[PDB]
Structure formats: C-alpha cells, structure tokens
Amino acid sequence: PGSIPLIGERFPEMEVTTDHGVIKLPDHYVSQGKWFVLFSHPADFTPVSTTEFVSFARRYEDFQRLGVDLIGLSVDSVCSHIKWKEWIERHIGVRIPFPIIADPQGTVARRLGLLHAESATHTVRGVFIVDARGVIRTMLYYPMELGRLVDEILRIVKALKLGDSLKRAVPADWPNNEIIGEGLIVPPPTTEDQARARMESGQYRSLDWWFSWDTPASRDDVEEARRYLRRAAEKPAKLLYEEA
Amino acid sequence: PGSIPLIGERFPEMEVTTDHGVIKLPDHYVSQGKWFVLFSHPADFTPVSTTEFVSFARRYEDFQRLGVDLIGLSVDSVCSHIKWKEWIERHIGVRIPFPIIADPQGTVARRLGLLHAESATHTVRGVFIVDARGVIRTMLYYPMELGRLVDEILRIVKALKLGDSLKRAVPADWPNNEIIGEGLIVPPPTTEDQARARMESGQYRSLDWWFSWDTPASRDDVEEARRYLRRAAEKPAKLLYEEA
Amino acid sequence: PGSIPLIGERFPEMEVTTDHGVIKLPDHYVSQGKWFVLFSHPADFTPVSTTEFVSFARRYEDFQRLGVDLIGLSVDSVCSHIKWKEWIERHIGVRIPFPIIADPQGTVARRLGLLHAESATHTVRGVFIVDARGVIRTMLYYPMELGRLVDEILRIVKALKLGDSLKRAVPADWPNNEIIGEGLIVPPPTTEDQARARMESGQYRSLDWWFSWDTPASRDDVEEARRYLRRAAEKPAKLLYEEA
Amino acid sequence: PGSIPLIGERFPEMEVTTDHGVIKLPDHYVSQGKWFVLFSHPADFTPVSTTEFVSFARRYEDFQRLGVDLIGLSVDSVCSHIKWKEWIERHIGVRIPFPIIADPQGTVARRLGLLHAESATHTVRGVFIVDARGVIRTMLYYPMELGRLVDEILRIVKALKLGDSLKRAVPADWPNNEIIGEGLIVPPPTTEDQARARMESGQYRSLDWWFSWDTPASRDDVEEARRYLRRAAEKPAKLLYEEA
Amino acid sequence: PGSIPLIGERFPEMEVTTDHGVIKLPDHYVSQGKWFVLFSHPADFTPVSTTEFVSFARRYEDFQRLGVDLIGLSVDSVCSHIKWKEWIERHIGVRIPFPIIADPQGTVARRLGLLHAESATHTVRGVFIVDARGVIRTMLYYPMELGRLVDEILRIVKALKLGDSLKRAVPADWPNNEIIGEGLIVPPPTTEDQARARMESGQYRSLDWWFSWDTPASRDDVEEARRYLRRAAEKPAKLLYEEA
Amino acid sequence: PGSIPLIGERFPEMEVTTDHGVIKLPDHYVSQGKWFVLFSHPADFTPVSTTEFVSFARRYEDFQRLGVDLIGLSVDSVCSHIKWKEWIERHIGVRIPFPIIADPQGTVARRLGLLHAESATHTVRGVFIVDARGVIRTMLYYPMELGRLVDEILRIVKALKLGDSLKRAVPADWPNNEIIGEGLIVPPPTTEDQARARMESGQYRSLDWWFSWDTPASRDDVEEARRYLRRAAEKPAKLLYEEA
Amino acid sequence: PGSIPLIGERFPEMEVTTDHGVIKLPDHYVSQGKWFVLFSHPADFTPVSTTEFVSFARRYEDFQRLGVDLIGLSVDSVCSHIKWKEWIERHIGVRIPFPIIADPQGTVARRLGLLHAESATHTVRGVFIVDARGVIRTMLYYPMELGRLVDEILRIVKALKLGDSLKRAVPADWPNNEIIGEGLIVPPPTTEDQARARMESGQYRSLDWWFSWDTPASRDDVEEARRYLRRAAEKPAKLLYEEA
Amino acid sequence: PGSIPLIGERFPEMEVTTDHGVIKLPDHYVSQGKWFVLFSHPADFTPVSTTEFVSFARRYEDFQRLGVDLIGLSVDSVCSHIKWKEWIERHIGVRIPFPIIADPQGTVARRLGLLHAESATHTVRGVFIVDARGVIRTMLYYPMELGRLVDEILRIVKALKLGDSLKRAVPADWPNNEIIGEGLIVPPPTTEDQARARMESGQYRSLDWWFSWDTPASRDDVEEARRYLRRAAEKPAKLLYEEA
C-alpha cells in the first residue's frame, strides 16, 4: 500500500530546500559527475538518527574518495536542521558537512515512498543510491527502531562502480565470496551460440556456461572494500560519549 | 515508478507455489512462531543468484538460531528450481534446504514491487524481513549486478529481535556504534512531562532528554551480532570453486 | 485558491499530537467548558514566532481568567517544540506553559486553510477563537512578516463572552466606541411590529428603531477590557533582551 | 467549509459596482500606487456596522497618510448605500467619504469567502489588506456580534509598509514588543553559511543566529503606530450619541 | 435563457424572510384559504417600484375583498424594506400594509425566474398569481423601464375566481368582450357525443358546438370588474406629489 | 419544470411555418424595422382563443400605427388555421389579417416555454413583445381559462416606445399614475456625485435624489395611451354575437 | 473467458526473446519467405513437453524441406531453455536446433490466448501455423495431459501450401479422402452464372455444381503427405529410451 | 482479434436448435455420461464440409464405441441442414446420423470464437472436445481451405479417456512415441521430497525424477488408437465418387 521510484529509473526531477540552499535533484550531483546517497530519518533530535549522521560524517571522506556525496532528508525545517547540527558539533564533537533536505509537507517523502505504516508523520530510514547519470541503483528501507550499517552503503557504492568499470556483476558478500573470493562475474551468455563460444574459448574460470568469473579488480580496490567491512566488524578503540 | 508493501504492514495474504509445496504467506510462518526472510533473484542458473543461495545456505543454522525461515522467489518454475538446486549440490557441494517460490506470471513479483526498470521480466534482489506476527520489518532492493551481504540480513534480524525483547532502538553500526558501542537507545520522550521525568531520573547514561541509552544486551547477543560482521569482513579460508 | 472552516461552524473533529500528548479537538476543551485559541506559526526557532509565544505566555493568566486555553500549531515535530521551549526558557527566561500541535505532514494546516501562497511548506499566523460549544467565533490570518497583537485576541474573547452572557452585539472599538463608549447594542428588530414595539417601549437609548443600546457590562468587565488595550498602548518598563 | 483567496495571492481580478461608480479591483488602486483595505458588513442600517463605518471615517485621514484607500462591501444595493450614508451624516454628523461595493447576488462575497455559517444571506465582517502591487497581505474575519478594532487595522498596514520599507519582520505587539520593544527583526538565515556569516559580522543585536534585530524605524514611524494603540486604549472625550 | 415554475404547478415550497417575519409559501396563504399575488421589483428606493407599491396599497382593500393577499420581493434586506416603507409613508402619505420578501442572495429570484438579461443583480417586475390551493394561475414579466397596470392584476384574480365558482372560461377583454359582452364561455365538448348533445339540448347561446356561453355573473361581479378598468382609464382627480 | 427566453435577450433565431408562409424570427420583422407581438393559444376552434383573435383583429390598425406586427402560434396545422380564419370571417364577420404559426410538434412552444402544467399538449396564452432590434421587452403568460386584455398589450408597446424615445421609465398605471399622473421618470442616479449634482441642478420635479420626473410626452402620446384603457373600460356599443 | 488472434489475421507484431536471440514476429520469418509453426508447452523439464520437442526435432528436416521454421514458447527463462536442451541432447541423444521463446511474464501467452483454465501460470499446448505473408492459417490447442501428433502439423502445412499454389481446397483426411482420394477441391461457384458455366464446361469431375475436383498434386507431394501419416501409424523399430 | 471459451472451462450453458430439435449444451450430453465433439463448417452444400461430414459419418461407430456423440454447427437454417443431409444420402449413399446446430445469427459461433478474419459471415472449421462432466478438453481451429483429419479427433478422445482412466499424461504421437512407444507418463513430482521418494521407490522406468512412465494401457487400448492412425495413412480401397 505505497508507491516508489525503481532501480534503473532516473531519480525523479525535483527542487528540494536543504540547510545548504535550494537544489535540483538529481541535476545538482549529475552536473558535478557525482553519485549521491539520499537517506532519510524520522526527525531531528532523535537518538538513532543522531548516531547515523555521526556514522555518515565519519565516513564522509570515504564517500568523497568514491566521488559520492550525501544528502539527508526529514520532515523537519531548515532551522531545526541547523540547530541539530550545532547540537551534534557541540555535544559529540562531530561536524556534519553534508546537507539535509527539509520536507515539512512530506512532498519528497511521498515521491520516494519514505512514509511507511510505522509512522503516518515521519519518514523511515530510506536509502537511495543514485549514480552520475542520475539513475537509481539500489534502495534500502530500514525501520525507525534500527540504525543502518553505513559500511554496507560504502561497499554497495564501491562494488557498483567496480562492476560498471570492469563490466562485471558482483558475487554475494564480495570481496569475501565463499565460491570465488574477490572474483567478479562475467554476465552470462544470452544465446546458445554465445554459451557454446564462451565454453570452447576457455577465456575464464567457469563452473558452467552461465557461471564464469575472473579477478580483474586491483589490490587497492579490493583492500578499500575489505577496509569498510573490517571497520564494521571491529569495536571502536574509543567511544565518543566518553569526552561528551 | 512502482508500488510496494510497507514497513509496519502485515505481509500481504497470498498462496504461493514453492518447490516444497503450496503455502499461504505469512500464515505458514506465523503458525510455527517463525520470522521469515523472503528474498528474490532474477532467474535460476544465474551466477550472482547462485552465490547468494550458497551464502544463505552456509548461514542457514545462523537463521535457525534466530528462529528465522528463508524463502526464495524467482519467475522460474518449480522444475527449474529443483534442477538448479541439484546443480548447486552436485557442482558446489552445497545443499539448499529452504523453499523457492515459483512465480511465472510475476503475480507475487508485482505484489511485492520486485519488478524494477532494470528488467520487465525478472525480479531484482528484493529482501522482505517479516516477524512472527506477519509484519514487514525491513525491505531491501539490491539490483541485478550486485549480490547481497547476507551477514547484514542476520544483523538486521538479530537487532530487530533484540530491540523488540528489550524495548530499545539500535544505534547505527551496532554493536560497534562509534558513540555508545554495544549500547541500546531508550525511545525518546514524546511529551514535556516525560522529558522532565527523564532529565530528573539519573536512570540512564544520557547526552540530552531525547538521547538516553544503557547496555541491556547479553554478551552472547553482542558477540553473535559482531561475529556476523567478522565473517563478512574475513577472507574465506578455502574457496568452494577449488573443492568443486 | 484555498479553503477554510467558517465562523459559526463547529471546529472540525480531529486528533492532534501536541508536546503535552494526544488530544481530540474541539472535544478536549468542550469537555472542560473552556474556550480555546488555536494559533499557528511557520516554524520553531523563528524570531517573530518566538516574540508571539512570549507575548501569549505573558498573557496566559489573562486567558486563564476568561476560561480560555491556548494551543499553538506548526509543521515541526514534538522534539523541535520541546527544544524550542527549552531555548525560550533558557535565553529569554519565559516558560511557555501551553501545548503546541506538531503537524509534520500539514494535515491540520490544510484542514484549517493555514497554508497561504506566502509559503507552500509553512503555516501563516492563523488564529481560531473557539467557544466552549466547539464553535469557531472569529478567524485572523496574519502573514509571516507581521507579529500579532495578542491584546486584540484577549479583547475579542472578552467582548464575545460579554455579548454571549448579556445577549448584546459589541460596537466598533469597544469598550471605547466613539458613539456609545462602553455601551452594548441590542440586536435590531427583524419585523415592522418588532420595530414599532421597540421604539414605543422607551426601554433603551436609540438613534433609530434599528440602533438601540444600554450599558449592562459591569465596571470590572469594562476595566478588564480597557487594561488589555492600555497594555498594548504602553511601552513595557523593561525589555526581556536585557538579561538575554 | 468555504473557499478564500490567500495571503501572497493577487487580489482576484473583478469589476465591482460601488456607490461611487464601477471600478476594477485591484487595478483601480494598483494604478494609483495605493494599498486598499476592503472590509465587509452584513447590511446597511445595522448598528455595529454603523459604528464601524463611523470608526473608519474618523480614521480616514490616518489611512490617507499611509497611502491606503478604504472600500466597504455588503449585499445591499447602491441606493441603500447612499440612503445609509445620508442617515449617518444627518443623525451622527459624520460623512462617509469612501466607496461601498453593492453585492446583491453575493458574487463578490462568495469569491472572497465572506459568507460564513453564521448567515447564508449576509457577509461577516471580513477585512482584506491589499498592497500597491495588488497582493493580499492580511485577512481578518470578525463575526456579526463583534465590531472590529480599526486602530489594529491601521497598525497592520503601518507595520506591513515599514517591514517592506526596511526589509524587516515585525515582532508581536510592535512597537511595544516585550523582548525588543520598537526593534524590527532581520529575516533569519536560510543556510548554515549565512547563519555563520551573520553571527561573525557582529552587525546586529542577536539572541541566536536565527533571532537578530536592529532599530531602523524612525521615531515618527514608532510614535504614529503607538498613537493608533493609545487611541484604541483611550476612553473618548465626547460620545457622538450625545450630539444627536 | 432561464427556467420558471409553470401555470398549473403548485407554487414551490419555500421559507422566505419578509419584513413581517418568516413565512412558508404557499402554505401560509393556503392555510387561510387566501389567494396571493407575489410580485417582484428591482430594488427599494427606486422610483417605478415606489409608484407600483403605492398603486398596490391604494388597491389593497379591493384585493382583500377578493380574499387575495399581496407579497412583494426584492434582493434588498428587511432593514432596507422597513426604511423604504417609512420613506413612502412620510413622503407620499401612503402606508404599505403588506409584506416584502428580502432575497439578498437571489435564492427566491432564481427559483421563480425573476432574473432576466436586463440585470444580473436585480429582479424584473414579475407577478405570480397563486390560488387558495397554492397553484400558479397566471405569470406576468414586466421589465425595469415599465410599471405594471395593477387594475389588470385585479381583473385577472376577479375573472379567475368567477371562472372557478361558475365553471366558465372568460372571454378576451371581459367584462367588455366585443362578441358576448359580459358573457362567460362554457368549456367546449371533448367528444363527438358531447358536441351533438350540446347543440341538441338548446341550453346555451351558441356560435357552434365548440362556442357556447351564458351570462351567469351577478351585476355586482361585472360592476366590480368594470370598476377596476374605469379606474385604470380615469386620470386621478388629485396627484399625490402635489399634496406632499 | 419549464425553460423561457428572458427580457433583454434577443428573440431566439428560428424558422417558423405560418398560414402566410415560412419566415425567420426575429429577422423578418427586424428587417422592416417593426416590433412584433408573438402570442399563443391552445388550439383553433376554441372559444376564448376566437374572442382573443377577434379582439386582436379589431385593434390591428392600432398595432400598425405603432409599427407593431402580430403573429399567433398554436400546435394546430396550417390547414386548421385557414379553416378557422374562414369560420371567423363567415360566422363573426371579422377577417384575421395577421399570420398564425403552425407548431404541430410543439418545437416553438417548448423553445418559448409555452407548454405549462395546465396542458402537456396545448400552449397557454403566452405574449412575447419584441422590439425592432429583435429584443424581448415583456412576457405575459395567461392561462387556458382567461382571455387577455388586448388594450394592455397596446399600452405596454406604446409606453415602451415612449420610454425608449424620451429615455424615461414609465410609472405604474401610466398615463394615470396616482403620484405623477402622465409624468415619466428619469433613471435614478448611480453614484453619490450624480445624486448631489441632480438635486442641486433643479432640472426636474423630485421627491428625493432617486425619484425625479418631468412631462416630456406629447398630449397626443398621452391621450392615445389613455384611449386604449378607455376602450378596455367601455361597455361595447353593439355585440358581434347579434349579427353572428 | 479468454481472447485469441484469429485465422486470416496477421500474426501480431511482437519482439520476443528466444535462446537464439531477439526476433520480431512475424517479420523474422516473412523476410525469409518462411512459414513458421509457433507452439507452446507448459514448462521446461516436463515429460510430455520433452517428448514433443524430440518429435519436432526428428521432423525438423521435413519442416525445413517445406520451408517451415519451428519456434517453441514457455514462461521459463532462456537459461532454463538452454539447460533443458543440454539435458535432452545428453540423455536422449537428440539436439533441439530450433529456438524457444522465453515468456516469463506471460506477455506472449496472453497475446496468443495460451493461458487456459487448466493452469493460470503455464501455457497449454498451442500451435499457430503462420504463412510466409505472416498470416495465421491454423490454430490448435492441445491440453497439458495430451502430447500433439506432430505428423498432423506437417500434413496441415503441406496441404495449405499445396492449396495455395494449386488454388484448391483440401478434402477431409487428404491425401486419403474416402470420396475423392488425393483429389483437391475447386472452390465452389459464387453466382448462378458461374454455376451454370462450371457445369456445362465439363472441365472437372463433379457431384454437383458446388462439388468439383481434379488431381493436380504431384506424385511427390502426395507421397510426402502419405509418408507423414505412415510414420504416425507405425511403431518405431527402436525406442530412444533404450540407447539412453 | 476474437474471444473463446478455454480448455478446463465448462462448455458454456446454451440452448441450441438442431435438425433433431432443441437441446441444452452441455447438459444434454452430461446427463447421458457422454463426451461430445462439437464441430463447425462454413455452410451446407460446400464440398470440403461434405467430405468432413462423410468422414465423421463413416467413423460414427468408432465415436459411439468411445461414448462420444457428434454435433455439427453452421449459420444455415434447419431446412438447409435436412436438404443437405438428403443430398449426401442420395448422391454419396451415406446417412449422417448426428444432429447439426442451425446458428443463423451466429450467436453460438460468436460464443465459441468460430468467426475468424477468414470470413465475417461463415464459421471456420472449429472442434470442441467436451468430456462427460461438460469440460472443454481440446480445441482445434482448421481454416476454410483445409479439411480435418477425423482420425486425429478419435485419437485425442481415446488418449484423453485413457489418461483420465489410468491417471497418466500421453506422450507426443502416442501410441507410437519415439521415446517410450505406447508408454504413458506419470505426472511429474511437484516437491523435492516427492522427487526424491519417486527416484528411491524404483516403481517406474525413469529418465529423471520429472520423467517417469509405465505401460498400463491394455493391448486393445493401444491397438485401437494405432488403428485410427493406420486408417488415416491407408489409401482408400474404393473411392465413393465412382458409385455416385
């Protein structure tokens, strides 16, 4: 009982008001050759939401390195956005460098299917991953009660950019796939003639005509992805509530 | 665009044909006191999809530990499901123990919004996480070209059940949150009287009246969650393609 | 190009979330035999809106003495309402004791015609004066750029309650009408026989059969109303920006 | 409910018949560089309405000083308007110099939402404040039983023109605001960069980055506005009923 | 064009506000066994309308003698109707004893088709003659520029009443018809047998089987009708403007 | 339950078949600069209708003098109209010189609202007075049972023509008006400035600024209008039945 | 309760995905001058369907000899088609050289009416015989439980082609018709003149003017058709499951 | 395009007129425990149609043996049917013993989709095979130019009845299937547990878990079905045209 944009569609044309000013999505980021992650949170001055903004801010340099920008969204006003960011910088010691959309009539929220049954008034924890052509590539809907794993958003963007450059599909749990490890998958043949040719070429390691792979990702690309998952797995050496 | 079910809605009533028989969802899992993860893949005998089925099968006991059942979905028929499972058992040495829905007219696909612009004929990589009351708790839409991180699906279910059983919300990147670590968040006050009572009480560690937390998770709960992430971050010991 | 509820209509039945809790309008006030003033402001942490909250708070006991409750309204969340009130108490030294409705999807705003062409997202400065029978008695629409004169809101409610108890209409600028001063107007005759009877009864001061008046308001009633206007007219002895 | 035009919309284009002739609204005042106040009353030869006409007439020069024209409205005919004006001059000694719209089919009444539930036949006491560009700036709906405070209408137009002149918003109860007195408010920053640039310039008195103000109003502007309210607050020297 | 109620239809049920009070049409007159003449005029304090009201008032006793009540209608208010009657009594020396409907939104006017293309806002000079069963017997539409001949309204009600009691049709120009004088017409036969049986019976004077008549009206009936027409033809002995 | 054309509307364009041939209304009379009176009767060989045709025929020259043509209408055929005229000439000694519309399907009757509740099959006694511009000036609907007073139709056309030529409105019962006798009324002023100018000009006899008149009709115009009413009031010199 | 395309209609324009690539029907075959038999089967890895694909593959050269291509259809994906063909080749020793449409959303099935009541999800056993102009010539619907007689499809195509080149209709059970054996039927006369002429010209053997025939089919054409039926009648010497 | 009833649906309820009288379909045959073959032909006294009727008549005993009744259909009237049957008996020496539906407004034809683009007026050569429960089991649409192979209609009802009786599916070209000969197919498993159980029971000859078969048909069943085909393949002994 709700409506979304879909993977492979252009992010819907819209003007949004952020605490950084007015911008056109996805044009603002397409014009810069950037990907963007648009994510939502229910309200300013909410605790899970605060832990997420801090997690994104900590990973901001990692997103920037991938050519990826971040843009938040809640139904709160720009004035609440700025007060909350000031609260976070003051009490947690973390500056939030990226804009937050203000969506008080829920116009953006209804366009993106961010209003679920869990709340009539407040957005769930949506994630739109949009590439530099302004095309939606991945969509996640986390609930109110559960913070995102931001390292998985880095892994998704890194794996998509690698798959796009190297003309490969990405196995489950890459770069630690149980069958092929850091291998990447050759898109399968679409005809009997191609299936025959691929097999009788011996160009790739294969389990069958429809399951071929190689290992074309650079050590640097693989170690960058492994770094995100290592950070997700390791307990942080110091907690930020300690000097708050 | 397209239409979807929403977080907090009852998974829609439907009878489906699987390679284990005909079942009503969600009724079939509710009656066993079980959560289910329903996930979709484009087609049988596709390589990324095969890696995902193998990843789910390795983690089958981890899902059963949480009282979670797995059910797959593609537009292929039962006969194709059974032959693809026999192929994975014979060639990779992995038995797929969970059922797969056969959805040849895309009836289930259209109901769950699993047909995106990337393909008019084959589902993307949808994930519906459904609790023992038949309520949709989380929805993920991964694309054709990118395998899922199955350990994040385990982390989501674990954290959702933890939040339900302790009346807590779960911070970003839990149990390795950068502010509060393995801490869990008390739902914030919703009135000025509750906010006052909270600031006067001293019961919780707190950054403000809206940001309180404690550490009520068992070490077992925390370390099991962290183990999912350590497994995602770990280079596999032996690649299944070799033993194949 | 907008719609409204009308004077003489029952305030529309609605459930609203305030920073004090959930209430039904107009029932929650009708139940108590109380009038309410519902007023709106564009957003929390806006300066004209802050001056108006401080003006209502200073007049709170004046409202309480007439049996009139106050309830604010904006499209911000409850958490922004509590933080804004905290800010006003800390920086201006004034407790806002009355509730504010949180209307993030604009549901209440659209119902009360509070969204004008001046902002698609934020409410203008509306005022609904609602009697103890739940009937809209008066409606004011001030713009973004102009704070209300809260003493005129007191005069309106006092004048309405007097007209109700004494069965009189209230002249322009009462209690300082240039024609009849503190006099109150007998509703005019509706028939020729009623007109002739009124005139030949000599019961009232008259300028014509359609313009009769007396002075049935007590000295206290008149003095209460005159104090509202003297306060509006007088520069306050100390400005609150001193200590602030 | 019923329909209205809205603050920030152009007053609706309309030809109206007045006791002074046929005029186009708002063009007839826009082309003179005049603001106008259009106000409604239920019927000619009604007592409250008569008090309000006399109130407006006594303040006629105050409106002319501000470059504001007055235009009345009821469902009565021109002939009745002229007879009622004659009666007021003869019995009260006050000439009504401004036009009255004759609206016998309620055509203008329905366009401006002046028919409320209190009467299906006669307009309530509507007030439309229209600027010299023809834009609706403020709307007031007083009921049948309650005369308007005309000095507040003067205060509104004066404060609006002052805000437009000096690019300021006007605080509650101006020029006797309890926080900043006769101070006028700088419209708040809309971006984090403007918020920071504002606070660092030290250009204004500030309570916070969103609450800045200065005292740019002339002593004349301030005392004119206070004079309106002192007149509202002063018991009249001589009641005009005495001299009939 | 426009639409109307019709001869032989029941006058439409309506509650109307008059300067004598609220009444229900036609019930108010039916319940008394009285005919009524409802007539409209564009506006109070118009000159042709005034002459028509004085003409009706002069003929009031002639109407009452027939068991016929008068009721007027304009889009003016009750207050204007009472002032207009005051004017006529003071300046012409004539009392208007019959009620005038106040129709300010033109609801009655629209129902009776009294708004013609001569004016969007004021009724023409309609006349509805309604019998004691509440049935529309005759309808006249005079224009703004032309006063009615009120003696023809008397002729119509007297002839219709005569026709009803004597079971006769009334010739052109009765009682001065050029063929049969004060003769009244027997309704013509509806069948060949009735036609033959009327010629044979020799009961009536006849020009053919379809044209039979007799003289059943009393001398007083005829003289009453003749008196109306003689008054119409005679220039009044003294003009009322002279005596003022 | 009926539709009519309206005073001030152009007579509807139509082609009609008469017993004189096919003509277009109103063009046929406009072309000649003639007024026309279109009148209806229920059916040929009916006795009231025959009295009306004889009355029209005897007044024919009075209509021709005024530049007014006559045209009848019934639902009977041309053949019936010719046989009916032959009968009247033979049995009554009166030639009918004007045409009669034949309206067998009631096409014209329905267009002019001539079919009332009194009969679903035959027209009532309608009268359309149409000026030389083809504009409907007056409409009368007499019933089946009551013949018209043809002299009032002459008086209407005469008074209308005189009103048009002299730019005057015609009082009740003109030229025998009880207030101003043969006086004609100046249209009332439309503005306060016109009211005052007219009153201080002394140009007209006046009861008030809205009630001015003079005597600009020739004695010939006045005596001709009065002669119509004298004839209406005269007992006929000899009845046509006696030679008939 | 289903819709089909019809004999004599052009096969509907559609782009289809086969395990040989993407083709446009009927264009792909028309541009080659080829007939095509489009046949459907419920699903890959079903036993009746397998028997039918082997029967078609065994007759592939008989189809090729007639200039007829074969194209299959099921709701299975291309990868399943290729895996199923590998299985047939490996286990039955028969290569399927013709393409199979993949119709996973049943788009083609619904267009062609191939979804009957026996299954909502899987196509019945449809056969469309389409000529070299792209016109549907014959449609067969066999059910799930009954394999087709593929020699009758060869007989149909052979008889239609023969009927096309010789301008003849083909009797029941041709080439073994019990009345005229291998004779072909002259289309009957359409007029009485053609009937008389046919019968007197004595050009053909005849039973009546509507039943003429000759023997224009070549010895080779007849024997080819007889060979199809002899193969259908004869049990194979060795069954393929025995060399399996 | 056209509409059709479907395999697995009840034959639609209809009353039809035949040359044997009125009957209800399918109830007429259901109530006897009889299958029926309803077939259509364009028109009586057409040559292909005649050959087909003669083929059905000669095979009537084979249909009667199987408990199958025959019923024809064309748009011709009953009289034409009887004249046509008389002609066949006289000129060909063959009695048609089964009824023919007369369908002159093509009511039955439209309901069964028997009017294709080949003729707007005459049906094509449709065949409905309906079982004793009144269910459509098979549908064939042969065109105008091509006679049916009646022996294939016998093979279909024989194979269907055998399949119903032995709970088996029938392979292509049965009883001469090139893989399993006169073997009949066990419906494949629908679950993995059923698949495994079947492969372990060793109860059936198998090519795979989805392809099991046995030989449960009597030698008489097999040889009767094979005889149908031998008859189709046999050059006839004596052509009936010779003795005609």
Ligand SMILES: *CC(=O)c1ccccc1
């Ligand atoms: C800052 C902000 O959110 C704002 C400012 C003016 C009006 C409404 C909202």
Ligand SMILES: *CC(=O)c1ccccc1
């Ligand atoms: C096994 C399977 O998918 C199947 C079986 C019979 C019919 C259709 C599909």
Ligand SMILES: *CC(=O)c1ccccc1
């Ligand atoms: C406090 C508040 O406004 C809130 C709390 C939880 C979720 C959304 C908003």
Ligand SMILES: *CC(=O)c1ccccc1
């Ligand atoms: C003066 C006035 O109101 C008027 C005049 C003519 C007709 C109607 C109204």
Ligand SMILES: *CC(=O)c1ccccc1
């Ligand atoms: C008297 C009259 O017409 C009136 C009175 C009150 C309100 C409106 C009209």
Ligand SMILES: *CC(=O)c1ccccc1
């Ligand atoms: C004369 C007449 O009315 C007529 C003539 C022919 C047909 C119909 C009507």
Ligand SMILES: *CC(=O)c1ccccc1
């Ligand atoms: C296997 C097949 O046909 C396919 C391949 C890639 C994606 C979807 C289906």
Ligand SMILES: *CC(=O)c1ccccc1
């Ligand atoms: C001849 C036949 O079928 C028939 C009989 C009577 C009426 C119409 C048709």
